[PDB]
Every structure is written in C-alpha cells, then in structure tokens.
A paper describes a structure:
SOCS proteins such as [name] are negative regulators of cytokine signalling of the Janus kinase/signal transducer and activator of transcription (JAK-STAT) pathway. The SOCS proteins each have a similar domain architecture. They contain a central SH2 domain that specifically recognizes phosphorylated tyrosine residues, a hallmark of cytokine signalling. SOCS proteins also have a C-terminal SOCS box that comprises a BC box that recruits [name] and [name] (EloBC) and a Cul5 box that recruits Cullin 5 (Cul5). [name] has been shown to bind GHR as a substrate for ubiquitination and thus drive its degradation by the proteasome.
During these investigations we found that, having been soaked with the small molecule solutions in [name], the diffraction patterns of the crystals could no longer be indexed with the same space group and unit cell parameters. These data for [name]-treated [name]:[name]:[name] crystals were instead successfully indexed with the alternative space group P32 and approximate unit cell dimensions a = b = 186 Å, c = 67 Å. The change in unit cell dimensions and space group represents a six-fold increase in the size of the ASU, thus containing six [name]:[name]:[name] complexes instead of a single one. Experimental phases for the structure of [name]-treated [name]:[name]:[name] were determined by SAD using diffraction data collected at 11.8847 keV to 3.1 Å resolution. The 12 unique arsenic peaks were confirmed as sites of cacodylate modifications on cysteine residues. The six complexes in the asymmetric unit were refined against a native dataset processed to 2.9 Å resolution. When analysing each component of the [name]-treated [name]:[name]:[name] structure in this alignment we find that [name], [name] and the [name] box of [name] are well aligned (average RMSD of backbone atoms = 0.62 ± 0.25), whereas significant deviations are observed for the SH2 domain of [name] (average RMSD of backbone atoms = 2.1 ± 0.9). In all cases the chains of [name], [name] and the SOCS-box domain of [name] are well aligned, with low RMSD values, indicating these parts of the complex form a rigid unit in relation to one another. In contrast the range of RMSD values for the SH2 domain of [name] indicates a significant degree of conformational freedom between this domain and the remainder of the complex. The ensemble of models found in the [name]-treated [name]:[name]:[name] structure reinforces this observation with the substrate-binding SH2 domain of [name] alone exhibiting a clear hinging motion relative to the remainder of the complex, consistent with the computational predictions. SOCS2C111 therefore forms a highly ordered contact that may explain the beneficial effect of the dimethylarsenic modifications to the growth of these crystals.
Numbering used by the authors:
A (entry chain B): 2 to 104
B (entry chain C): 16 to 45, 58 to 112
C (entry chain A): 31 to 134, 149 to 198
Amino acid sequence: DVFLMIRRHKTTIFTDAKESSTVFELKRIVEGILKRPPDEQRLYKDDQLLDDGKTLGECGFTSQTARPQAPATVGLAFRADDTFEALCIEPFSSPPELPDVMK
Amino acid sequence: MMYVKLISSDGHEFIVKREHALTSGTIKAMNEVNFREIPSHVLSKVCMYFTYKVRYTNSSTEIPEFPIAPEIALELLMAANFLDC
Amino acid sequence: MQAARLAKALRELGQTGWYWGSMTVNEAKEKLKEAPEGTFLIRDSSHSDYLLTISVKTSAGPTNLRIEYQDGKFRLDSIICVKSKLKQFDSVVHLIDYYVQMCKHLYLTKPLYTSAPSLQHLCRLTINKCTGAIWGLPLPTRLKDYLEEYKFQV
C-alpha cells in the first residue's frame, strides 16, 4: 500500500493502491472521480512526468516514503483542446507566526 | 457513495474516500461540504489524519507518529474540535 | 482522599492511548518485541501489591517495571529501584511524563498506542510540548480548558 495526494490547481485527491499498481491504473482511478480519460491526463512526481507502464514503486513512491500521515504529492494536468496544459498546483494557505508563548 | 468533497475557507478542494471522512463525527452528520472557518493548510492536515486514523484502527502493525507543526497546532486543534476527531 | 486521587489518575491514564488495561506479560512481550528501545506502555499489574506496570523495550528485550500506589502516591517498584533515589507523584501519567523528559536512568521514549489517538489530543500534545502558559494562548475558553485537563508531553 502507498498513500498519496493527487494535485491539480486547487484540487487535491486522497487515495491509495498497491506499490505495484501502474500509472495508468492510477489515471483510471482519477477517471472514476474527475470524469476525464487516462490519455488526456499527464501525471508527475515533482518536476518529472510518469510512464503509464511503470509501477508506482518503480516511479519511486514506496510505502516507506508515502505513508498515511505524510502522503506523497502527485502532479496532474489536463488536455487543453489540441494540447496539454502546464502542470500547475495552487499552494496551500500560509500559517500565522507563532505567538511568543510557544517559543 | 464512494467519495466526498471538502472545500477550505480559501477555496482549495479536497476529495477523500467516503469512509475516511466519516472519521470526523461532525461530517458523519452529513457529496460536498464547505468550511468557511478552516483554511487549506489546516484542512489538508485533517485529511491526512483521516488516512492515519482509518489505516491504524485494529492494527497488527505498530501505529506510527502523526507529526504536527507548532504553527498549525492551534488552528488544527480548533478544527479538530469543530470536526469531532 | 486516596480514591479521588486514584480515580483521577485512571481518568488521565485512559486519555493517553497507551494504557492497555488487562494486558499480559506475554502479550506485552510480543507487542514490544521488535519495537525501538525506549518504547513503552502501561498495563494492569498482576501482582497483589502492585497496581500498574510499565512494559518497556530495552537492548536486552521487553521487560517490566512495576508502579506502587501507596498512601495516595505513585512511584516505581522500590525493590528494583533504590528507594532513596525515588520521586513520588500524584499521577501515573505525570510519573511517566517526568521520566520521558529526564532521559532527553530510566529510558522511556515513545509510547506504543493501543489505537490512534484523536487529532484534538495530538494537538494538545504538540501544544503542551511548546508551552506551559495556557492562559496566554490565542484560543477560546473551552479549548483552553481542554488543554488544562491533560498538561503532559506524552
């Protein structure tokens, strides 16, 4: 098992599957939630994109480095008409500064 | 259902498994939910805790630590009280 | 006042998430067998004289150290630990908390949780690790009260 958050723009999806599952299978799971197809979706780990045939483990996801409490981020970008859009992620809110009481 | 939607106070959309969101006793009371009081940096953590909690119920495995940064602790406390979890 | 103090101590103990109740020695041993040195938990003591026991991982293996509750106070088993070198506590969590901190003598580190604690509690733990002054926190009165109920860092 491996736990991850799939992110595009302001959207973020929490799910999981086998470390041995394929990037296409993950794309197919996105189709069950967001209703777009696998061939019109491009995934990514940080900056580098992913291959449909490789396992999530082969992509470097491992149970060790993508656990429930700290699930790994997976980039996502849609097929803009006759091309693909630039993978973009809206950052999360910024926390306040700590009060002096909490050192 | 299979999934549900949670929208932070600053608009971020978070989608989680149906039974994961049932961790929050407040959420169990009601496919989409808006949170005007809870920002995205806090609500993202609340989704992580759901993964954690469900994963480590009746656990043959050792339950690991759920790290919380001091900066979010105060807001996460208020949220976690809000959500009953 | 013996009861009042015991009841409270047990109320706190239930809040920890590492009080395993009627766990056995062989159950504690199998649980802690491969866990990290210093991993600990508390369970009921089978012995007539003792109320609770600390079951902890050591380089040797999982072992047990008992807790006396006599005359309204807790302390570690004075047979194994030198009585002259023993502090006393009105709370068994306070006792454990005190020893967790000191070794940053008895090596306790992280508790082995029976089940995932609440997020509210998990925050309470983080918050308490930063500060003692609860009164001076940007929080409503009910949340401040929650933090009062369990002051500890573990």
